[PDB]
């Protein structure tokens, strides 16, 4: 179906503790494929998925160059930004960049992204048109004017509409068995009585891919959102995800409740009953 490639950069200034720490991570959908850490011994972009391991040294050379160039720009920008907000050398600060593109089932460009954040708060973002910028504050307005004069949006659009989608095509072909997979969830149910008249009914969804799942509780057919607890979709650590949904039910009425699991990897939605 529709796919996405995304990159997440983090630059953290460490005063007195040397130079800023730069961490870069690359994703194709919910699969982390590349990494870079300024603290690691390698000082190279490293593979984190089997399908990217087939890339030659010319790929790793270019990726390392790009990522180090941004780490160096962030090193200077950290200084510039503390002059903007008039902050001391004393404090530790954070620069975060998110960028990428979404493709349709045809493998053609849909939408592109580029957004920056200083100290967790939105700084500057490239608009949907990929031609204009949105500055979140007065400091960001200076960056906006600089980026407007330098025609930064044209260069970003050229990547997001161009090279970004072309890499995604290459990645989707080279990792078809992994990226185009639809792992269905391993469902099971647990019952734990809290009181003599109340009980917790918990429904599990394990080892599924992609991360997109829908867990819903129903009482005799009617939807149930009252007394329902949900956990954030968590990684299993093997490239699959986990999620559970619980409901507090009156003792003896456990058979009335049904859990409905909705996932891409399922031919039809599952119905679980205690």
């Amino acid at each position: 179906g529709s796919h996405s490639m995304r990159y997440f950069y983090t630059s953290v200034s460490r005063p007195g503790r040397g130079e800023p720490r730069f961490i870069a991570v690359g994703y194709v959908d919910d699969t982390q494929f590349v990494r870079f850490d300024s603290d690691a011994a390698s000082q190279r972009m490293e593979p984190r998925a089997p399908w990217i391991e087939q890339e030659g040294p010319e790929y790793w050379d270019q990726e390392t160059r790009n990522v180090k160039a941004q780490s160096q720009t962030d090193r200077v920008d950290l200084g510039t930004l503390r002059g903007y907000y008039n902050q001391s050398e004393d404090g530790s600060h954070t620069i975060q960049i998110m960028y990428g593109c979404d493709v349709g089932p045809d493998g053609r460009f849909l939408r592109g992204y580029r957004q920056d954040a200083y100290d967790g708060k939105d700084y500057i973002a490239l608009n949907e048109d990929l031609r204009s910028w949105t500055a979140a504050d007065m400091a960001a307005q200076i960056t906006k004017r600089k980026w407007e004069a330098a025609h930064a949006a044209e260069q970003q659009r050229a990547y997001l509409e161009g090279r970004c989608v072309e890499w995604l095509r290459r990645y989707l072909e080279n990792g078809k068995e992994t990226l185009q997979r639809t792992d269905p969830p391993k469902t099971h149910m647990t019952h734990h009585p809290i009181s003599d008249h109340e009980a917790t009914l918990r429904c599990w969804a394990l080892g599924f891919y992609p991360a997109e799942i829908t867990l819903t509780w129903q009482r005799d057919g009617e939807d149930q959102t009252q007394d329902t607890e949900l956990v954030e979709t968590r990684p299993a650590g093997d490239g699959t995800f986990q999620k559970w949904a619980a409901v507090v039910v009156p003792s003896g009425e456990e058979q009335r409740y049904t859990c409905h699991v909705q996932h891409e990897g399922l031919p039809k939605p599952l119905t679980l009953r205690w």
Partner: peptide
């Protein structure tokens, strides 16, 4: 693959 150029200062 990552973005090479621009990489312009803030």
């Amino acid at each position: 693959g990552t973005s090479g150029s621009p990489i312009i200062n803030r």
